Amino acid sequence: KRYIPSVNDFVIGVIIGTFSDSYKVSLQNFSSSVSLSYMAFPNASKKNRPTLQVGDLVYARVCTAEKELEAEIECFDSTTGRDAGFGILEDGMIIDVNLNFARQLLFNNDFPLLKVLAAHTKFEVAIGLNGKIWVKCEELSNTLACYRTIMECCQKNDTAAFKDIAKRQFKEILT
């Protein structure tokens, strides 16, 4: 069960190349890359061009995933035309997780992890269904605590243990 791009999936990739009219983006190692058009951004034109570079993390939406063709991703909201959280992810940390964990985090409102984290710290989170969680707090120590917490929660997949895992991981943090 390696990740297969399907349409409308939110994913986190890394820019692995810049080409004439698109980025090559990796959603997982040892897998085929996906394509991010330079036009796939808010109000994008040949004048209004993106400025991402190799090694940048990007949050995106799978827009096409045809059989036997390179899948394509986009970094804007189809309805509003706005970034809506898609685009570059800066100054945060990535946790690699199993695909079910990511799916739970994105779609299950009863999944208690975000609520557990929120009791300890303010954070920003982006959830890639390709098995990557991105997290960022104001303070590095808080970001790190979220990183370790999310990683340990994923490995244990015991939702009742999440609260205790976070409590331990945030032990030396005022909040």
Place this chain on the structure above:
Amino acid sequence: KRYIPSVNDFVIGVIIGTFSDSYKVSLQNFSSSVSLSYMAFPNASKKNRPTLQVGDLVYARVCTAEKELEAEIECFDSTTGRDAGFGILEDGMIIDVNLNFARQLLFNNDFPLLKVLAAHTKFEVAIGLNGKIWVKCEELSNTLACYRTIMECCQKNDTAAFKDIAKRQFKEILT
């Protein structure tokens, strides 16, 4: 039928004052202002403070609207902790619309206006249920065409005329 803040409403306001720990924000003229805490932003703390000023337009979410108290708005996503399109609205144009028009635009996927506009130009749109639409295109002429189109569509409220209104308003624009 003037706008009454209710919880979870997306609204567009203008910063009318800056205070010690919040902005005073107007959602409509001749109405009571609402309150935007300096903490009501992504990863906000007393160090990580917002930089909005009087006259700035803001997209926000009504978070509290108690009876006989000043309503409160926020500029982040409660789940993700990210801006999610909330915050400052720059370099676009505002159309004042009736509250039903805004409600239709935000909630009705069959309402054909956005699709009608999209056939003519790429745009960014934000919809305030307080009766304000914000639109922005790369080119000023396109932004203006969207502005006039949205305004005329609202006054006529004849969804079948939308296509023709846009066609006329975008007459001198290559797209």
